[PDB]
């Protein structure tokens, strides 16, 4: 899993 900044944010596993 990792935090991705689109500019809100997403936690993707």
């Amino acid at each position, epitope marked *: 899993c990792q935090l991705i900044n689109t500019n809100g944010s*997403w936690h*993707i596993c």
Partner: antibody
Amino acid sequence: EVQLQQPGAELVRPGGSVKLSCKASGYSFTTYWMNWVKQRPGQGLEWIGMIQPSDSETRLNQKFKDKATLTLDRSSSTVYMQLSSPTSDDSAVYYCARTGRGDAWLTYWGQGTSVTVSS
Amino acid sequence: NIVLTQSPVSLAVSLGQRATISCRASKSVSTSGYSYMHWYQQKPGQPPRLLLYLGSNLESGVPARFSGSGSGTDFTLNIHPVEEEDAATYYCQHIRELTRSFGGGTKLEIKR
């Protein structure tokens, strides 16, 4: 049902001002992101920016740095875009659109406001 | 800014035939198991209609005849059996970074 209410058109004297409105209904206003998109009839889409209603965070397309100001009114469930120093180049349809999840895909769209900049 | 280049500029496809539309980004729009590429359909006098999000997810109500694929910098819009109501302009759009960009559009004309 989710609905984004936009006026049909705005007539604006060049140099005058104009502040476009987008009234959201059908969901908790303080969720998702409201985006603004420009389109000359016949031509493509161009993204101006977005506002997050939960905390008023904004992101703006630096090409509109000095043209677009995004604000909101929580009690009105309304999001606003003001355009500075309107010229004939600002004449276009402006859509507001709400993301379907988070800050991402644009599920819900206003009908668009056609701004005409003319004496 | 990421520039999104679509091709072709326009295409004609007969009432049963195939339409395949392409979108290439300036740099990747992928992170983790997500591709932040999205597709829209527009007909004159109306706002765009989201068809596909996250590369390959059909929005609710959108016919199974529409399908998307791609990874990284290359994306594909495919339309199963082309029906008459598919005459439209199709746009790709990325959610990867601030300054969302759209592709230039692809007008689908039906042959008849």
